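Handout, section B. The chain below has 130 residues.
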Amino acid sequence: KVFERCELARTLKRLGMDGYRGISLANWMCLAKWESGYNTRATNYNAGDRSTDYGIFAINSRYWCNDGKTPGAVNACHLSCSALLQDNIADAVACAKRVVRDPQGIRAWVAWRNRCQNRDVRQYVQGCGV
């Protein structure tokens, strides 16, 4: 499913993402926008290390979910990577929360550092009623 901006903002808010570990809803939106274009079916294979980024938050198989085909990978969110390809983003949100409980927080995603860190991200939530 490809979310429309405000639809996603409210969906994330209802799922408890606003201010989760200090991360604003606008930061989560900027992350999803640059990681998948709000596409829950987005996938990116990384030929270099044989891992795959899954879903709306492009969560990687080397550490976060299990797809059975990633060399020496772990599964910190304890989910099949298939759970990260559902139209319903509850499991993906649960996993994203797990990612940020680690030391780096939102910085875990390099894309956030590149496209969201120290940027004006107000535009992501304006007019969404969140």
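Note. The radius of gyration is 14 Å. Compare this with the example in section A.
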